Design a protein around this ligand. Sequence first.
Ligand SMILES: [Ca+2]
Ligand SMILES: [K+]
Ligand code: NA
Length: 259
Amino acid sequence: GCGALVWVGEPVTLRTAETIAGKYGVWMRDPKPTHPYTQESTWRIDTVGTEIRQVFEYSQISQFEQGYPSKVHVLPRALESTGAVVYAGSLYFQGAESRTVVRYELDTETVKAEKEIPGAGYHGHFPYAWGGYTDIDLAVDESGLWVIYSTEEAKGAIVLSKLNPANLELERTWETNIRKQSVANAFVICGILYTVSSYSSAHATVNFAYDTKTGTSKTLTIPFTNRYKYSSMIDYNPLERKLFAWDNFNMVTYDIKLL
Ligand SMILES: [Ca+2]
Ligand SMILES: [K+]
Ligand code: NA
């Protein structure tokens, strides 16, 4: 059952990248797995380099922990930053030097939809506090697919849109009063957008919650540990009820509890 976030566990490290190209990246499982994948299927994308086009796939968690992909997908265009998600058999990612979200069906290796996110800043315009090109952050929660961004119209405040997963049409949009560049990262749980205060502190907090049901925000002080002091990616998986994160070469999870 859904509820507000009340607790975040301490990070558990599943894999440590062995090259500097893995200092930051995105890794994830599918909260709505579809044949031929399972809830154990894992994807991993190192994103420090240029021309990021290869997506590593692991059919078993033990393969992921040992660093041995079972498949490698080649994307037809390059991918930007750490914000991508997998949902219902597709990778949703941002095209390099663009504000375009691309739907890449993993089993057929085909692009099924593209969508320019209207007004979205990109390429270091509205990054998170972590910097880089973290302007556009996709998210999956219990009700489906979302994208987190900002616009000049919103003057840098986080904008949140719900997306049709088949054709990437924007179904609804909310404008917060939370400055995107002031928070380390963000994610959605049960229709509530949460932000993290710091990418480096061992005593950070989940520090804001914006509820889409009310269109209002509140402060929070839920403790959050950046164990390795450089978190580039923090997302939520509603099937596992865990945060998945990338922190200074380490692919980690945080258990969460809801009220
Ligand atoms: Ca995120
Ligand atoms: K980046
Ligand atoms: Na994301």
